[PDB]
Amino acid sequence: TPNFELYGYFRSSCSGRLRIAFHLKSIPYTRHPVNLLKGEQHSDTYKSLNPTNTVPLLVVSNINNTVSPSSASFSIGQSLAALEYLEEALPTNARPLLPPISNPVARAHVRTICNIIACDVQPVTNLKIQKKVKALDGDPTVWSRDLATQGFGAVEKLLELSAGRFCVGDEITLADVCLVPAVWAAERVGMDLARFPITKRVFEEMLKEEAVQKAHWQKQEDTPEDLR
Amino acid sequence: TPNFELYGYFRSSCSGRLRIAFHLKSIPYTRHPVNLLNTVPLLVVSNINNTVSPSSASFSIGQSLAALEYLEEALPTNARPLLPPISNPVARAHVRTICNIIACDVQPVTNLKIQKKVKALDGDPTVWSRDLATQGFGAVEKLLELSAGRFCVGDEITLADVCLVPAVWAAERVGMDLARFPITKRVFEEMLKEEAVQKAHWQKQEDTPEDLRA
Numbered sequence: 001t002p003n004f005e006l007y008g009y010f011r012s013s014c015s016g017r018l019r020i021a022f023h024l025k026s027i028p029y030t031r032h033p034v035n036l037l038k039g040e041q042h043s044d045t046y047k048s049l050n051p052t053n054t055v056p057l058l059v060v061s062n063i064n065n066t067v068s069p070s071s072a073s074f075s076i077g078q079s080l081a082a083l084e085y086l087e088e089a090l091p092t093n094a095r096p097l098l099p100p101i102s103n104p105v106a107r108a109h110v111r112t113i114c115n116i117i118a119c120d121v122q123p124v125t126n127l128k129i130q131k132k133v134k135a136l137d138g139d140p141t142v143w144s145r146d147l148a149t150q151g152f153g154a155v156e157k158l159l160e161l162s163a164g165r166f167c168v169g170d171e172i173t174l175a176d177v178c179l180v181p182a183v184w185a186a187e188r189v190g191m192d193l194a195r196f197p198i199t200k201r202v203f204e205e206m207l208k209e210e211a212v213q214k215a216h217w218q219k220q221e222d223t224p225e226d227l228r
Numbered sequence: 229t230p231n232f233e234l235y236g237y238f239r240s241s242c243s244g245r246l247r248i249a250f251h252l253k254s255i256p257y258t259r260h261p262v263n264l265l266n267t268v269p270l271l272v273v274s275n276i277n278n279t280v281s282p283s284s285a286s287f288s289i290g291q292s293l294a295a296l297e298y299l300e301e302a303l304p305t306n307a308r309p310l311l312p313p314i315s316n317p318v319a320r321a322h323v324r325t326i327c328n329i330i331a332c333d334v335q336p337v338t339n340l341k342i343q344k345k346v347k348a349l350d351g352d353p354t355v356w357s358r359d360l361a362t363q364g365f366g367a368v369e370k371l372l373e374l375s376a377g378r379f380c381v382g383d384e385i386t387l388a389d390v391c392l393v394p395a396v397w398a399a400e401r402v403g404m405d406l407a408r409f410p411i412t413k414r415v416f417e418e419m420l421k422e423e424a425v426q427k428a429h430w431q432k433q434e435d436t437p438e439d440l441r442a
């Protein structure tokens with residue numbers, strides 16, 4: 001079985017996706033905080049680890065690295081690729097986070113929700129983009145609020161078809177894993193979550209989960225005291 | 229009613245991802261071009277058992293990465309798997325990471341919607357987009373330094389290549405220098421040799437304006 005080390009940041013939504021998945025699946029992992037406010041993502045040493053200068057970075061070891069056989073480890077620098085790797089590399093794990101492969105329709109619904117969040121909301125509202133907006137003399141908060149609002153609109157329309165207790169029927173999936181940290185992020189920029197009633201119900205359902213609380217941005221080792 | 233109908237646009241990179249996949253996997257689809265001036269691409273999937281909405285025999289997929297993986301899973305015996313086998317989760321992960329750099333970190337911040345928002349701030353959407361594409365291609369190039377053979381990962385075409393090609397076409401529009409990414413350029417050029425990629429070429433669609441056919 002593989003060993004896992006996560007380069008993460010308490011307030012990184014993409015990091016939180018992995019934090020949630022690890023706890024849900026009962027997979028132990030080693031924590032390596034990277035301070036994004038201090039620009040530790042920008043150091044040459046971290047660019048060597050992840051060439052996008054982003055967190056999370058998942059470093060997997062005790063495995064056969066089929067891409068670089070001489071390497072003791074394998075690095076996964078994008079959260080959705082890392083989430084699917086947990087699913088594929090640990091097929092006997094007691095808590096699959098996708099519908100079974102015999103249900104490609106449900107799997108596509110789950111992935112569509114993940115992609116709206118990970119493609120259309122997070123990347124255009126992250127720190128790097130907010131800084132580019134500020135450098136143009138725009139308001140990064142309004143920019144981000146408008147884009148998150150629009151993206152949550154798309155998520156809500158999907159949940160109108162798929163949601164039961166959770167995003168897609170009555171079991172937690174990768175959709176819920178992506179939803180929770182995106183809601184934490186959207187709240188930082190003053191998005192009105194009540195405009196999205198199903199999304200809000202499902203988010204609140206997830207907050208009851210011990211796995212989600214263990215994963216909370218306010219409960220990490222690198223959460224500053226003032227934010228705990 | 230067609231099994232697959234693609235609401236697409238000749239110059240949409242995300243549409244281009246799906247065109248390349250359908251041609252490479254030889255999956256027939258009905259083309260539904262959509263004018264510039266509403267999700268594009270939107271893949272409408274019909275004649276199915278809808279396990280999410282059972283009173284319906286169809287659904288749509290408005291995100292290209294989800295649509296790509298759906299084609300893999302809905303047609304498991306297709307002659308051209310675009311992921312490495314499930315027995316090789318490392319290679320699958322490396323493929324998906326390259327796809328995600330492009331689909332998460334490049335395309336969405338350099339698309340029409342965001343270029344318009346940049347212009348609305350009196351910014352230069354070309355410089356903005358070239359800057360972001362250059363940064364993401366830097367990351368793609370670093371991954372290909374580890375994995376590339378003939379193609380992005382090893383010597384077989386995968387979803388990494390399918391995402392790579394339309395991203396190169398989009399990046400060229402904003403003046404990105406592809407020569408700065410030499411393995412990326414090499415794999416891009418290898419893909420252009422493919423009949424399936426040519427059939428999928430942004431310059432060779434039914435809705436390509438005549439002045440952009442060459």
Ligand SMILES: N[C@@H](CCC(=O)N[C@@H](CS)C(=O)NCC(=O)O)C(=O)O
Nearest residue numbers: 012013014054055078079127128332
């Ligand atoms: N698509 C990437 C996005 C990674 C990303 O943008 N991470 C953010 C934190 S959520 C980051 O490290 N930001 C650094 C910066 O913007 O300077 C993924 O899914 O991992």
